[PDB]
Amino acid sequence: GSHMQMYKNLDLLSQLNERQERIMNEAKKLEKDLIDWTDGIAREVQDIV
């Protein structure tokens, strides 16, 4: 009845939380790639200069 409807809706959090964890993972990835890019370019430019 009303309670099961309520529980099914509360349970949609599962999918939303999956998405939140994906986006957080992609932000961490991006941060690490930006750092590694910057460090890698600096080493290369130092090699040139």
Author numbering: 1 to 49
Authors' account:
In the Rabex-5CC structure, Rabex-5CC also forms a long α-helix (about 65 Å) and the four Rabex-5CC in the asymmetric unit form a tight four-helix bundle via the nonpolar surface. Rabex-5CC forms a stable amphipathic α-helix that tends to bury its nonpolar surface via oligomerization or interaction with the C-terminal regions of Rabaptin-5C212. The nonpolar surface of Rabex-5CC has good chemical and geometrical complementarities with the nonpolar surface groove of the GEF domain and thus might be able to bind there to block the substrate binding and hence autoinhibit the GEF activity as proposed by Delprato and Lambright (2007). Nonetheless, our structural and biochemical data show that although Rabex-5CC alone exists as a stable helix in both solution and crystal structure, it cannot form a stable complex with the GEF domain as shown by both GST pull-down assay and ITC analysis (data not shown).
In this process, small GTPase Rab5 functions as a master regulator of the early endosomal biogenesis. Rabex-5 is a specific GEF for Rab5, Rab17, and Rab21. Rabaptin-5 is a key effector of Rab5 and plays an important role in both homotypic and heterotypic fusions of early endosomes. The GEF activity of Rabex-5 is autoinhibited by its CC domain and is activated by the binding of Rabaptin-5 via its C2-1 domain.
